[PDB]
Each structure stands twice: as structure tokens, then as C-alpha cells.
Amino acid sequence: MVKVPECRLADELGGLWENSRFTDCCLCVAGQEFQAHKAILAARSPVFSAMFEHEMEESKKNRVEINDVEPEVFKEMMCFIYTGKAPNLDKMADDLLAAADKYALERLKVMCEDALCSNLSVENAAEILILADLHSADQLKTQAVDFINYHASDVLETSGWKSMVVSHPHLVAEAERSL
Amino acid sequence: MVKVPECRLADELGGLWENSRFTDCCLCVAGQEFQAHKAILAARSPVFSAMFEHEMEESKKNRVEINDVEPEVFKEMMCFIYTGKAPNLDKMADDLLAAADKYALERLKVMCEDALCSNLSVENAAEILILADLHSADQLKTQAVDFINYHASDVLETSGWKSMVVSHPHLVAEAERSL
Numbered sequence: 001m002v003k004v005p006e007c008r009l010a011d012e013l014g015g016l017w018e019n020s021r022f023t024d025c026c027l028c029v030a031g032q033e034f035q036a037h038k039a040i041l042a043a044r045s046p047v048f049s050a051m052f053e054h055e056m057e058e059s060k061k062n063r064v065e066i067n068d069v070e071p072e073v074f075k076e077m078m079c080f081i082y083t084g085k086a087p088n089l090d091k092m093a094d095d096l097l098a099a100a101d102k103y104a105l106e107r108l109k110v111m112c113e114d115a116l117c118s119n120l121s122v123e124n125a126a127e128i129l130i131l132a133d134l135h136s137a138d139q140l141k142t143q144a145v146d147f148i149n150y151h152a153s154d155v156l157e158t159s160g161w162k163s164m165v166v167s168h169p170h171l172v173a174e175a176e177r178s179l
Numbered sequence: 180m181v182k183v184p185e186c187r188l189a190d191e192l193g194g195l196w197e198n199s200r201f202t203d204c205c206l207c208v209a210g211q212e213f214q215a216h217k218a219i220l221a222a223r224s225p226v227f228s229a230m231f232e233h234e235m236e237e238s239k240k241n242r243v244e245i246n247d248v249e250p251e252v253f254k255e256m257m258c259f260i261y262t263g264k265a266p267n268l269d270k271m272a273d274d275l276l277a278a279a280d281k282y283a284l285e286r287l288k289v290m291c292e293d294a295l296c297s298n299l300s301v302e303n304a305a306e307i308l309i310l311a312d313l314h315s316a317d318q319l320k321t322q323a324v325d326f327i328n329y330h331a332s333d334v335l336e337t338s339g340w341k342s343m344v345v346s347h348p349h350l351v352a353e354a355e356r357s358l
Contacts, residue, residue: 001288001293001317001320001324002288002289002292002293002296002318002322003318004286004290004293005285005289006288007263007286008286009188009189009192009223009263010261011193012222012223013188013219013222015222016218016219016221016222021218021221021222022217022220022221022231023217023218024203037216037218038201038206039200039201039202039203039216039218040192040195040218040219042195042200042201043191043192043194043195043200044188044191045228052201081196083188084186084188106184107183107184107186107187109184110181110182110184111183113181114180114181114183117181122298138180139181139182140181143180143181177188
């Protein structure tokens with residue numbers, strides 16, 4: 001009988017970030033400044049949480065330098081922190097995975113693992129496994145290994161797989177060990 | 180293939196409120212103090228938003244006196260502000276409706292309207308319509324009116340309906356007007 005309207009939590013918090021209201025800290029990524037809210041970031045990221053709890057000296061002035069991350073990628077990570085969503089994840093899923101790994105955002109990591117799995121191809125599968133091992137992406141590592149074994153004939157004939165034999169021989173090991 | 184884990188946004192924000200981390204304002208309800216976060220409250224409630232934007236003098240010290248609301252009801256309203264949920268809504272749906280109305284929390288209002296509609300009974304239907312008109316609960320008003328008309332024989336014989344004829348004659352009007 002009664003129609004309850006759809007929850008707007010995620011979008012109202014997305015509003016805070018977008019219009020910079022009641023902010024209390026500043027994040028500087030390649031010279032760009034972004035105001036944010038410590039409590040939210042801390043609640044969503046163990047890395048941010050410990051930074052703000054143990055690691056800022058007052059002379060930083062609630063102000064965090066970000067060296068590890070491209071601006072566009074950082075915006076998306078932050079859109080995720082505030083809203084649970086990442087609408088442009090497909091255009092940047094490798095760098096976003098790296099960012100989510102560095103800020104220990106588990107779910108975003110897995111969202112990236114999902115996108116990348118759907119893009120597994122003969123030509124990119126070695127690259128994707130490297131990435132996944134690099135970034136502690138377990139489901140994606142497993143999927144890449146399986147994709148490599150189901151397609152081993154075509155995959156062995158790729159420059160990417162050849163490159164990898166030299167560059168990361170232990171991955172070749174683990175994949176063979178998948179017997 | 181890849182299993183994305185369930186979003187934890189709402190519960191992590193529920194964590195902020197529960198463990199009072201990075202708070203920046205204080206809410207005092209019947210002598211009890213509760214620390215909170217202005218940005219979140221402002222983003223979720225237009226009332227809280229304008230209070231903090233236009234209506235605090237520094238000599239209040241980020242500190243809000245709450246006269247209009249019982250403690251238990253206030254906890255639930257705040258659990259809603261931070262998480263979108265209200266797990267104990269059924270035991271307090273009339274007072275919670277009043278609270279959501281005073282803090283302009285539309286969705287919580289409608290959640291209360293839903294609970295109360297499911298509890299419409301011959302004996303309480305006059306009471307519920309009064310409440311609903313009192314609190315600008317449109318869907319609930321409409322449902323109570325319809326329930327009254329489908330059950331008008333038994334309802335007219337209730338002390339509640341009789342009381343109401345005297346106490347709020349214009350409601351009787353609107354219900355008759357539903358012809």
C-alpha cells in the first residue's frame with residue numbers, strides 16, 4: 001500500500017564530497033587540492049584511518065600529500081569512498097585496482113577484479129596475471145590462471161606470455177602447478 | 180566468476196556514530212550527550228543543515244539542545260541518519276514519525292507510515308488518522324481514510340471515532356468527502 005522511496009544515503013554523501021561542505025581536511029594530488037571529511041575516509045579506509053589517528057603532526061595542517069595516484073583515478077576512488085560506486089571504473093580498472101590496493105578498499109578492489117576478468121583475452125592474459133599478483137587480487141589471479149590453462153595453446157604464442165616467462169618465472173610456476 | 184562482496188557503507192558510517200570517532204559537535208537530549216558529525220547530519224537532514232549553516236553562534240560551542248524528542252526515539256532517528264535503517268521502528272513508529280517530521284527526514288517518515296498502516300485496526304484508525312494529519316504523512320492519511328470507509332460500520336461504534344468527531348471535525352469532513 002505505502003510506497004517507501006529509494007534510499008538516498010549514498011548520493012547525499014556524494015553531495016558532501018562534490019560541494020565540499022563541512023570539510024575538515026585537504027588532499028593534494030599532483031598540485032590539485034580536494035577538501036574531504038576525516039571521519040568518512042577513516043570509516044571507509046584503514047589506511048586513511050591510521051593516517052589521521054596516528055600520523056598527522058599539527059604542522060601538516062590536516063593536509064595529505066598524495067604521490068601514488070593519478071588525479072582522475074583518485075577522483076574515482078574518492079567517489080567510491082563516499083558513495084560505494086565507481087561509474088567510470090571500466091576506463092581505469094588497472095590503476096583503480098592499484099589505488100584500492102594502496103588504500104585498502106577491499107570491495108573496490110574486487111569491483112576492479114571483476115571488470116578486468118571480463119576483459120581477459122589471449123593477448124592480455126599474462127599482463128593481467130602480473131597485475132593481479134602485483135596487487136594481491138586473489139579472485140583475479142585465479143581467474144587469469146584458469147583462463148591461461150583453458151587457452152594455453154594460443155597464449156604461449158603471445159609476446160606477453162613470452163615476456164612474462166623471463167620477467168616473472170614464479171608465476172609460470174604457479175600456473176603449471178595448477179595441474 | 181568474481182564474487183563482489185556486499186557494500187558496507189551504511190554499516191561503516193554506523194560505526195562512526197556508535198564509537199564516536201572524529202566527531203565535531205554534540206547533541207543533548209534530556210541531559211544525555213551524543214557526539215556526531217555535522218557534515219553527515221547536514222547532508223541527511225535539511226533541518227540540521229540549516230541549523231549548522233545559519234543558526235549556531237560560536238558561544239553554543241557546536242552544541243545542540245534537543246527538547247522535542249525522547250532519548251530512545253532520538254537514537255533510532257540518528258541510527259537512520261547514519262545508516263538508512265531503523266531496526267526498532269515497530270516499537271516506536273508514532274514518535275519516530277513525529278521526529279522524522281520535525282527533522283524533515285522524508286524516507287524515515289514514510290517507513291513509519293508503512294508500519295503504522297500495517298497496524299491499522301478498527302479500534303485505532305481514528306487515532307492513526309489524527310496522527311497522520313498532525314504530522315503531514317500523506318500516504319498514511321490516505322490509507323487510514325480508505326480503511327475507515329471500507330470499515331465504516333464498526334469504526335463509527337468506537338470511542339476513538341466518537342472522540343474524533345468532537346476533537347477534529349474537519350477530518351470527519353475529508354473522510355465523508357472521500358465519496
